[PDB]
Amino acid sequence: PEPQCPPGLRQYETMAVLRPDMTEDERLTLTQKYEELLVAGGAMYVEVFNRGVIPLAYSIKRKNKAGETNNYLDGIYLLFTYFTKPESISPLEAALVTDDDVIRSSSFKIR
Amino acid sequence: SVEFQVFCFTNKIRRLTLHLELHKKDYSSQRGLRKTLGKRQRLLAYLLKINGVRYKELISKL
Amino acid sequence: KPRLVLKFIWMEKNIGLALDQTIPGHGTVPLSPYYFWPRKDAWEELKVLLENKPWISQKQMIILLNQATDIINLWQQSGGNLAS
Amino acid sequence: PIQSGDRIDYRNMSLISRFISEQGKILSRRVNRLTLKQQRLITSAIKQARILSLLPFLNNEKQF
Amino acid sequence: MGKDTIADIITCIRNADMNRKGTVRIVSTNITENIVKILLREGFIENARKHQERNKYFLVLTLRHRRNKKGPYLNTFHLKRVSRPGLRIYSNYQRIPRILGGMGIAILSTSRGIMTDREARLEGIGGEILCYIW
RNA sequence: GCGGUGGAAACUACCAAGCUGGAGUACGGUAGGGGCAGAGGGAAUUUCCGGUGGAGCGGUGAAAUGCGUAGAGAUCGGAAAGAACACCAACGGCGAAAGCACUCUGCUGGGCCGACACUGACACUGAGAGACGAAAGCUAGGGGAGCGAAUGGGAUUAGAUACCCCAGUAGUCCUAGCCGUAAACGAUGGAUACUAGGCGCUGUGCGUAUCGACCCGUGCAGUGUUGUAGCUAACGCGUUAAGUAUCCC
16 A cells, blocks of 8 residues: 555654653654654654553763753653655654654654 | 767767766776766777768767 | 583583584574583583574573583582582 | 465564564574575564564573 | 687687587588588588577587597597688788698688698689688 | 888777676565664773761882872762773674674665576776875864873882873874874785686575584585695795686776
């Protein structure tokens, strides 16, 4: 079902880990910035599914906007099996670095 | 098909050149541009060796 | 996947640890490797051989390593004392 | 063995962690007994999962 | 298919029998056909056969031997080029050499066809010496 | 030798016309530390800031200079900094060479394989030329933790401008250039054709086997190790020749 659209442009999958605290505006507001990606990308944007929060190995260094406070052991594991033009992925990187509830966001390009 | 080789290499040099001039330091693709120029140039000396008028058309097309 | 035997020998100076290993889903022939009288490592040599196999499951490697460890341990104590 | 059809990704933490040690370091091709292609692909995937802190960079030593 | 089509056949002959293999596969152009035609009839080789593989007509050529020896052919064949591409050689009907007195032959390109020393010495014609074997 | 003239057309050349295996292209795959740019990463080291505790720490062939009661080192936490990227790493992959390995993205080179899908010799080499070209060096500006020419002190020493040790500047890194040399080494210019094998590795292709990963043979290309023939003064090289030949510098 996914090989329908990739005549024309590319395919990706972004892994992004989250804060473990909030349960509200986490599925919501990060899907709203996924709608910011929808203004950017506008392709078969499906399967943005969530993975359960588990203890990771080692993480420090949240870098809140002038917080620089929280160490972590847990995080919500979002991954977006999205699909876009190869133009404007670096603004997705800046969007997934600058926002607070998204730390350590590594995108990929499955083949 | 020869004029698709010359025309295809011409679009190759267009897209690779507008890559390279806004980039300016890739010293690997410089060989690709120069192999394309030399390869196309031996094609143009080939079709000039065969014909007059037809190679004049290849000059006048681009 | 067949299952396994470490054989130890204690003589006062010298341990030998001997690892006899077995087949995965791929038909293989191990020896028993005997690790030797000089101070050259027995556990590292044995465990590394097992890891190099992957043909050995974790349970199998560990059970043999635990038995090997136990003998090296008894050997160290007997050598430091005179048990015999 | 254990190729299992589906390709090795960072999301597949079953065959991954059969390949690292408990000390958390990548084992070679002659130990893991794969092809060169399997080895490089789990290498890049394991280092990706190393970025996502799914896997430790160092495991603290233990006895008893 | 390199630069030369005659060092093609010839170097396949030397490289053929210096490894004692009594079988040659070469291309069959016009001048190769003429050389093996004026070479089977002079007792050096045994048979030349044309066939096809992908409708490309080739020559398989059977070399001479003798019986079970240290090497099954006694007289080493000793083929040699002369008129290299880039250094053409040309002879009158005077210069045309009797190779080793006559034990070798000098296949050469007359205006008639390509002859040997017998068939170009009686003619009185001369021409471009392709190669001489001995 | 040169010239005139009459004949021959195989070879070089010429004229014309086809041909495809040479060479390319189109297409589908495919592998990659190929290059450059942008983001991101964590160990470790050093320094600083705190809590502890109190006499050495560090170093060596043995010592010493140094640092330390102004609290060193050690230990735990907090920052910051630059530089390099452990295991994977393989007698492995790629690049024309130099080189290239933390990961991810973008642009982009090059290779390999198949079908005839196309053109029809477009080929090879290359004087002079042009590009790139480890490291050290230099101009300009940043940056500077570690290491460290010069230098300085201690030691060994008859002596020590040296090996050892403690500090340590240029440099190392980056931006933009210049320089254009190296054991820039495979001590082997490039290209094509042909000439035993064994044991390997990498990439793809076919058939077997299952119907799916294997696994066997293979078609090629590349990489390695023993080795026939032949060559070689010998050592050795040996389908990736230093073999047999042809061309070019």
